[PDB]
């Protein structure tokens, strides 16, 4: 039977959406169907921050971050636990946890 009203993707009114390559396995996945997560991370991993700051030549250094839109295929999203299998009722919750 039909599992999802959206067919596991976000494509109503298009027909075709260009693929993106998974960042784990390089699988071709439609962009509307990928599991994109945006990674904003401090560049010093938050455990060496004081060591880096105390070794810094500038006071109150801004400590920039890295920005990366990470795209996953469904197989790699499930395996890396980016998403998890959900019950039939609560598959309908679009709101992020």
């Amino acid at each position: 039977p039909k599992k999802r009203a959206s067919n596991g993707r976000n494509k109503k009114g298009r027909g075709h959406v260009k693929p993106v390559r998974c960042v784990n396995c390089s699988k071709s996945i439609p962009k509307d169907k990928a599991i994109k997560r945006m990674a904003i991370r401090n560049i010093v991993e938050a455990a060496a921050v004081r060591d880096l700051s105390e070794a810094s030549v500038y006071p109150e250094y801004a400590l920039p971050k890295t920005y990366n839109k990470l795209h996953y295929c469904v197989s790699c999203a499930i395996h890396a636990r980016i998403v998890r299998v959900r019950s039939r009722e609560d598959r309908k919750n679009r709101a992020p946890p």
Partner: protein, 226 residues
């Protein structure tokens, strides 16, 4: 893997720091902080003539530690060596670009990204490709989530942007442009021109690429420091 290289010599040394001597590299008067660092060259051996081993050299420095202000932290300047005066060499402007984190930080969803590039010629006979980036912004009191532009705002915005970058750089020397890019007055002037199209926050000028320079004209470079 220290001892696994199967073959590196089928046949079966001088420390170069001794051979290398530090040279002073300096910024023009268009930037307030003059001394920016030190470079390395091998000795003055007849085959190499270290003076010409120095002339084609570019060092990328932050505008913050080139102007002593954390408000310039997100801009980096490429400075190109031009000639050597006895271990006291002197550079000219070579190119400017944005630091990676700033450009990534300004790009967010639920707004429109408006990029505009121009290849206008500086009156000093310098040819520059100047890139500008702007973002449509939420209006104060706006309830809509996304504040997107309508693709004809974007054409009009790009048009008024490109006219500004063309007019300003065409009619200014290369040094004058660098001294007007520092106070960011180009970004402000674009804000006033596009205010009647879309609110358009974050209107910075990203990379300033130098494409080709005129004849060296040793007097022009010495004009900055004399």
């Amino acid at each position: 893997a220290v001892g696994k290289n199967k073959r590196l010599s089928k046949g079966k040394v001088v420390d170069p720091f001794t051979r290398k001597e530090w040279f002073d590299i300096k910024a023009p008067s268009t930037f307030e902080n003059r001394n920016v660092g030190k470079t390395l060259v091998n000795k003055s051996t007849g085959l190499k003539s270290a003076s010409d081993a120095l002339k084609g050299r570019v060092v990328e420095v932050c505008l913050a530690d080139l102007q002593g202000s954390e408000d310039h932290s997100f801009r980096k300047i490429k400075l190109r060596v031009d000639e050597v005066q006895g271990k006291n060499l002197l550079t000219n402007f070579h190119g400017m670009d944005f630091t990676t984190d700033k450009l990534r930080s300004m790009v967010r969803k639920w707004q429109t990204l408006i990029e505009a590039n121009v290849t206008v010629k500086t009156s000093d006979d310098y040819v520059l490709r100047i890139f500008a980036i702007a973002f449509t912004r939420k209006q104060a009191n706006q309830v809509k989530r996304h504040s997107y532009a309508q693709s004809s705002h974007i054409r009009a915005i790009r048009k008024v942007i490109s006219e500004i970058l063309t007019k300003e750089v065409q009619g200014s020397t290369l040094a004058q442009l660098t001294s007007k890019l520092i106070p960011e007055v180009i970004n402000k002037e674009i804000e006033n021109a596009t205010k009647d199209i879309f609110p358009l926050q974050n209107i910075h000028v990203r990379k300033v690429k130098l494409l080709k320079q005129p004849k060296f004209d040793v007097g022009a470079l010495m004009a900055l420091h004399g």
